[PDB]
Amino acid sequence: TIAVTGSIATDHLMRFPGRFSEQVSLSFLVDDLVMHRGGVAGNMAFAIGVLGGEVALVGAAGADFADYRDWLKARGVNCDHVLISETAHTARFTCTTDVDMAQIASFYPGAMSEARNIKLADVVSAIGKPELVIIGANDPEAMFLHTEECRKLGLAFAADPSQQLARLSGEEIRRLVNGAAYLFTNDYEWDLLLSKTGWSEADVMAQIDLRVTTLGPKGVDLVEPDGTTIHVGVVPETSQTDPTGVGDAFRAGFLTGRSAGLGLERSAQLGSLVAVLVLESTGTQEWQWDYEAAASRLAGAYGEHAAAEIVAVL
Amino acid sequence: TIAVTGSIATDHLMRFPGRFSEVSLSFLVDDLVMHRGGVAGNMAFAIGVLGGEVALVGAAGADFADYRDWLKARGVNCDHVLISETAHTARFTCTTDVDMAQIASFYPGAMSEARNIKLADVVSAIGKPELVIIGANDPEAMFLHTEECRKLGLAFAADPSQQLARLSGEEIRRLVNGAAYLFTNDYEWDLLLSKTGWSEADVMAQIDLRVTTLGPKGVDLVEPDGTTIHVGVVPETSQTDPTGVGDAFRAGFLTGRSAGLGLERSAQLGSLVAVLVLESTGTQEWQWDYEAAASRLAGAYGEHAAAEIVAVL
Numbered sequence A: 001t002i003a004v005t006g007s008i009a010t011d012h013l014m015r016f017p018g019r020f021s022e023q024v025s026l027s028f029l030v031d032d033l034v035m036h037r038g039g040v041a042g043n044m045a046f047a048i049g050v051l052g053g054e055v056a057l058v059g060a061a062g063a064d065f066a067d068y069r070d071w072l073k074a075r076g077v078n079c080d081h082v083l084i085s086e087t088a089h090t091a092r093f094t095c096t097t098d099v100d101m102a103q104i105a106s107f108y109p110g111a112m113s114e115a116r117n118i119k120l121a122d123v124v125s126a127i128g129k130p131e132l133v134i135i136g137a138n139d140p141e142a143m144f145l146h147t148e149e150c151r152k153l154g155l156a157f158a159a160d161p162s163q164q165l166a167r168l169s170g171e172e173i174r175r176l177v178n179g180a181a182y183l184f185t186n187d188y189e190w191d192l193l194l195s196k197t198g199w200s201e202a203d204v205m206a207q208i209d210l211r212v213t214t215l216g217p218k219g220v221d222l223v224e225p226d227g228t229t230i231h232v233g234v235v236p237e238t239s240q241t242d243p244t245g246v247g248d249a250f251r252a253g254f255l256t257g258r259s260a261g262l263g264l265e266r267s268a269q270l271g272s273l274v275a276v277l278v279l280e281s282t283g284t285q286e287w288q289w290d291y292e293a294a295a296s297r298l299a300g301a302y303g304e305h306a307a308a309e310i311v312a313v314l
Numbered sequence B: 001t002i003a004v005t006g007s008i009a010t011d012h013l014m015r016f017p018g019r020f021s022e023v024s025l026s027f028l029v030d031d032l033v034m035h036r037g038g039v040a041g042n043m044a045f046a047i048g049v050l051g052g053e054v055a056l057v058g059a060a061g062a063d064f065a066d067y068r069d070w071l072k073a074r075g076v077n078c079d080h081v082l083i084s085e086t087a088h089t090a091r092f093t094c095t096t097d098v099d100m101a102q103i104a105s106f107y108p109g110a111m112s113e114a115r116n117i118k119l120a121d122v123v124s125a126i127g128k129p130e131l132v133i134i135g136a137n138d139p140e141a142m143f144l145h146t147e148e149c150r151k152l153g154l155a156f157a158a159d160p161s162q163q164l165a166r167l168s169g170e171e172i173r174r175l176v177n178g179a180a181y182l183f184t185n186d187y188e189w190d191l192l193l194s195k196t197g198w199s200e201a202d203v204m205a206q207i208d209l210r211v212t213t214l215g216p217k218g219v220d221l222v223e224p225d226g227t228t229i230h231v232g233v234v235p236e237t238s239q240t241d242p243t244g245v246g247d248a249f250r251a252g253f254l255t256g257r258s259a260g261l262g263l264e265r266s267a268q269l270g271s272l273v274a275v276l277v278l279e280s281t282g283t284q285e286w287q288w289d290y291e292a293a294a295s296r297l298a299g300a301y302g303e304h305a306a307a308e309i310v311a312v313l
């Protein structure tokens, strides 16, 4: 049972058919505008549900969440513990993506700010202790309180600060990392974390059980404290539609695989599959799950043996 | 009777409490409001509020109901808004920083259907308007509107504004000839001269008046013979949001001209409406207070000019 904390949002996604090239008053004429369900916690919960996992969504939304709830619940997500603001609206992510998958975005937190009032003790009380708590991009204070609560209650947690790393300070990031069963970042975020925390690579590795560093088209690295390193290349894409939510999908597929008892490499291969499915669609939860297509692409990228091992648990 | 053609939209306006000075830009914003917008909507709203007879001529989606009720409640004739069967109203998405710098993206949507609007139908229904504003719109719609104005003998104001970036030289040239007014800002004026290959005198020989807004330095009104009037801004008490300030200036100026005011008095009224828009979030969220208008006009331009302006409202 995975508890997913983080932002719940509506993503307003636009497509610019050009290349961001301005060199202030930028204006981009866009040829596509879609509104989809989003937020890192929503994306990851959706993906874990679709893949058949036991998952609860733990975040702060406004009252408009009804339809979103019905969507998530239809894929097995426990939405009981979504905090609903009576006054604030759900967070909104507004993003314009160009031909090269470069993004210009703005994020309005709104109801997300109230996530600091959520107590994991209540979720535990209601559902028992989850096997993993994902501390995703959220209200910063909510992130700290969730992490501290996980440490006090003995809950294994995955640090997934993601977009909020830019906002947070060194002391803040440091307070987020110690004791994590997983640390998730991309490579640029990994460099930024090392810089801001003042930690060396070995400083971080001595405080976590596993580092997962996504590398975009170069795949993903999984590094154990002793230096054991697994590199998993991407599932090659047939199109680059929109990069929004690709990292969330990788994390969700990877942690679903781990929850199904798969090894590190097999879990990362499954995560790579879900990631490419998200890369090839517009929106973070618009991707479809086709069992046979999944088997086929997994086998093409990683071999029939790995594909069979992966699909056997889904 | 002023006919306003141009974009009808919903403006999604955000505020970045920082300074745009940071590819993967990400801005954490502390305000998000959704307001009624589009250049034609803004100008029609302003002309209605100020008591003018105005018709809105643009393309919207089906959600336009509430917007229509609003505009009509301020006296705007919305009969000739074309309503798309499938497309939603255009959306303008903008993030503004402390210095009023903007990073925006514009989705035309239903606006593209404005090319199917015939000004002849509007004329038929309401008679010949005293002025047609060719605001930022579907480019082909802009050309067809301008040509129709020339064909029917309708005086028109060239107001390409945001679309100048999209359009080409020949296109811009096609928009200008015969205009009773040419509206741009100073940067847009330079860009127009560059892209069209025209000199200043080339343009002035084809229009009756050039109006070039200069942001904080006010506005210039240049006649073909070189007669030039400069009108400073109405000084602001706050820089809230720059969206729609130019539309408000144009609307106040052309309302003044329709009320028989001179060029300078009309530009002073336009400066007032412009500052009212600058001091609020959204393009049509500003209120009209007669006494506050008189007082600020008198403070900026003298009691005489203020009395002359308010006498017609």
Ligand SMILES: OC[C@H]1O[C@@H](n2cnc3c(C#Cc4ccc(-c5ccccc5)cc4)ncnc32)[C@H](O)[C@@H]1O
Pocket: A007, A008, A009, A010, A011, A037, A038, A039, A040, A043, A092, A093, A107, A137, A138, A163, A164, A166, A167, A244, A245, A246, A248, A284, B018, B026, B027, B028
């Ligand atoms: O994974 C994609 C999902 O993320 C969801 N989302 C997209 N942004 C976010 C954020 C965030 C942020 C941020 C913080 C600070 C600055 C900043 C400001 C000023 C100066 C420097 C930095 C900028 C941006 N937080 C939570 N979820 C997000 C989206 O809803 C989408 O579905």
Ligand SMILES: OC[C@H]1O[C@@H](n2cnc3c(C#Cc4ccc(-c5ccccc5)cc4)ncnc32)[C@H](O)[C@@H]1O
Pocket: A018, A027, A028, A029, B007, B008, B009, B010, B011, B036, B037, B038, B039, B042, B091, B092, B106, B136, B137, B162, B163, B165, B166, B243, B244, B245, B247, B283
């Ligand atoms: O006056 C404010 C009102 O304008 C309304 N609006 C805000 N934009 C627009 C536009 C436009 C544009 C444009 C064209 C071309 C490029 C471009 C692309 C690629 C490369 C170079 C340039 C970008 C942007 N058109 C009509 N109304 C607008 C808003 O609804 C608001 O209320």
Ligand code: NA
Pocket: A241, A242, A243, A244, A245, A246, A278, A279, A280, A281, A282, A283, A284
């Ligand atoms: Na996507």
Ligand code: NA
Pocket: B240, B241, B242, B243, B244, B245, B277, B278, B279, B280, B281, B282, B283
């Ligand atoms: Na404004």
